[PDB]
Amino acid sequence: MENFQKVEKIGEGTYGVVYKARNKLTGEVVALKKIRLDTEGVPSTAIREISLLKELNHPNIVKLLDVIHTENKLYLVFEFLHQDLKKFMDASALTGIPLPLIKSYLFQLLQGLAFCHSHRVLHRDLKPQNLLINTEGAIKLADFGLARAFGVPVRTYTHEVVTLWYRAPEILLGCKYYSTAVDIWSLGCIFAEMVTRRALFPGDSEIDQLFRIFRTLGTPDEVVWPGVTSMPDYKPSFPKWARQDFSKVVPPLDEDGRSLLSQMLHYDPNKRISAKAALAHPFFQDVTKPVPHLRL
Ligand SMILES: Cc1c(-c2ccnc(/N=C3\C=CC(N4CCNCC4)=CC3)n2)sc(=O)n1C
Numbered sequence: 061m062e063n064f065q066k067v068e069k070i071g072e073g074t075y076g077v078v079y080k081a082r083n084k085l086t087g088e089v090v091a092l093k094k095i096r097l098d099t100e101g102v103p104s105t106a107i108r109e110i111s112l113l114k115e116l117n118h119p120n121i122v123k124l125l126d127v128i129h130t131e132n133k134l135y136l137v138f139e140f141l142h143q144d145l146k147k148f149m150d151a152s153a154l155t156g157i158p159l160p161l162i163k164s165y166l167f168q169l170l171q172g173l174a175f176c177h178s179h180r181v182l183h184r185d186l187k188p189q190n191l192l193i194n195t196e197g198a199i200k201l202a203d204f205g206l207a208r209a210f211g212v213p214v215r216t217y218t219h220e221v222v223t224l225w226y227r228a229p230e231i232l233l234g235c236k237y238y239s240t241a242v243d244i245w246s247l248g249c250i251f252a253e254m255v256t257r258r259a260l261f262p263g264d265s266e267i268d269q270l271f272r273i274f275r276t277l278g279t280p281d282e283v284v285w286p287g288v289t290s291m292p293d294y295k296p297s298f299p300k301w302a303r304q305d306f307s308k309v310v311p312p313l314d315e316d317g318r319s320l321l322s323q324m325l326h327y328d329p330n331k332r333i334s335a336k337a338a339l340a341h342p343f344f345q346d347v348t349k350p351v352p353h354l355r356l
Contacts, residue, residue, distance in 0.1 A: 061128055061135060064092055071144075071189070073203045074212045074222065080140060090125060093136040096217050098210060101132045109209035110136070116181060120172030122192055122202035141200060142356045145250075146188035151355055153257050161350045162254045163317075163343070165191075165199045169247060172201045173335035177240040181205060186246035187226045188253070195356065197349045224269040225249065225262050229280065230329055232270045234292030241329035244338070248324030252310050255317070260309070271299070277325065278303030285327040316343035 064081040071078040073093050081092040107129060114124050128135040145165070149157070157165075169191070176183065183190075183204040190203040206212075214222040228245035230238045252260040261276065263269025274280070279300045280288045288294055306318045313321070320343045323333040333341075 061130065064090070064135075064137075066092070072216060072218045072220065073206060074185070074216050075206055075210060076136070077217065088125075089140050091122075091138040091140045093138065095134045095136065095206070095210070097132065097134065102129060102134050103210070106134075106209040110134070110205065112181075113205040116176065116179060116205070118172055118175045119198070120168050120200050121176070122200045136206075138202065141192035141194050141198075141202075143193055143354065144189050145191035145193055145199065148193055148352065148354070149188055149254065149257070156257055157254050158350065159255075160346075160348050161197075161352060162251070163347055164197060164349050165193075165254070166247070166251055167339070167344050167347050168199050169201065170335045170338050173240075173243050173247065174339060176201070177243070177335055182208075182240055183243045183246070184208070185226075186243055186250065187223055188250060189223075191250070193352060193354070195352070195354050197351050221264075224264070224266060225259050227269055228329070229270060229273055229327060230291070232266055232273075233288070233294050239329050240334070241332040244324050244332050244335060245329075248321050251317075251321055251324065255310050255313050271301075274298065274301045276304050276309060277327065280327045288327065314343075316341070319343075 063084055065084055067080045067082055067089070069077065070080050070091065073095075076093045076095040079092045079094075080089065082089050110127050114127060117123060122141065123139040124136060125139060126137045128137065173183070181204075183201060184207050185204065186201070190201065192200050192202050216222070224232075226246035226249045228238065228242040231242055249260045261269060261272040263272045278284070279298055282289055289296070306322050310318060310321060320333070320338065320341050324338065326332040
């Protein structure tokens with residue numbers, strides 16, 4: 061809109077392009093998301109779906125400040141946070157993020173997710189790029205509720221590929237009515253990634269993604285994942301790999317963290333820990349809120 065001066069492109073929200081922008085009236089600087097319209101103006105369904113998001117406010121959810129549906133168009137105006145977790149991970153790769161700060165971030169996000177999930181909202185696409193951090197030690201969920209309202213192309217507008225690395229295996233095997241558990245999976249993968257400084261399952265197509273998972277956790281079967289063999293894209297011809305021990309997967313994480321993670325990465329989404337229950341895990345008995353060394 062004319063109310064906003066674009067200061068810089070900071071991202072893509074797979075549907076939309078996101079800009080740092082300055083409110084010409086209120087001086088506030090904001091993240092401005094302009095949603096790519098199916099051109100099929102804006103489905104009215106989608107509008108009332110985004111409306112609900114304006115009320116889903118939490119210290120660990122990036123605050124949706126306004127939705128602007130005017131003339132053709134749909135813009136989302138969020139509070140601006142000064143970087144994503146991906147850049148901090150990148151910046152931290154040589155020394156590794158301190159464990160107490162890993163823990164604070166995991167904790168905080170579990171609080172975000174516990175809140176969302178308690179309102180039957182799923183993120184569905186958690187990744188380091190959709191997690192935003194500030195200088196005070198907050199970490200916040202972003203870029204969600206978008207994906208319910210419209211369906212997103214994989215090549216998107218910007219021609220960059222969609223990241224699969226954080227996809228739960230039920231989604232990959234073709235389930236439609238998957239659950240809050242998908243986000244716990246994605247968060248486990250990020251958790252591992254913060255701890256190791258390497259992505260856990262950096263697949264580059266759906267089957268590579270799924271076989272990377274199989275390789276580390278074992279090919280799923282009916283013993284560990286009752287029902288798995290009736291899922292839409294499950295093939296009896298999947299290679300049958302044996303499970304790694306987690307001690308190989310995320311050294312040198314301590315037994316509590318490792319145990320937490322293995323429950324976040326349970327194949328069966330029903331045996332996968334919830335966000336609420338994860339908060340009560342012994343790993344957070346010594347949880348603190350440290351200050352990050354940022355590079356703004
Ligand atoms: C980036 C973003 C949103 C957003 C919301 C609030 N703050 C921010 N802040 C930044 C997000 C990204 C960013 N980058 C800095 C350099 N390139 C990597 C990403 C700098 C700032 N983004 S909302 C959404 O859908 N997306 C994709």
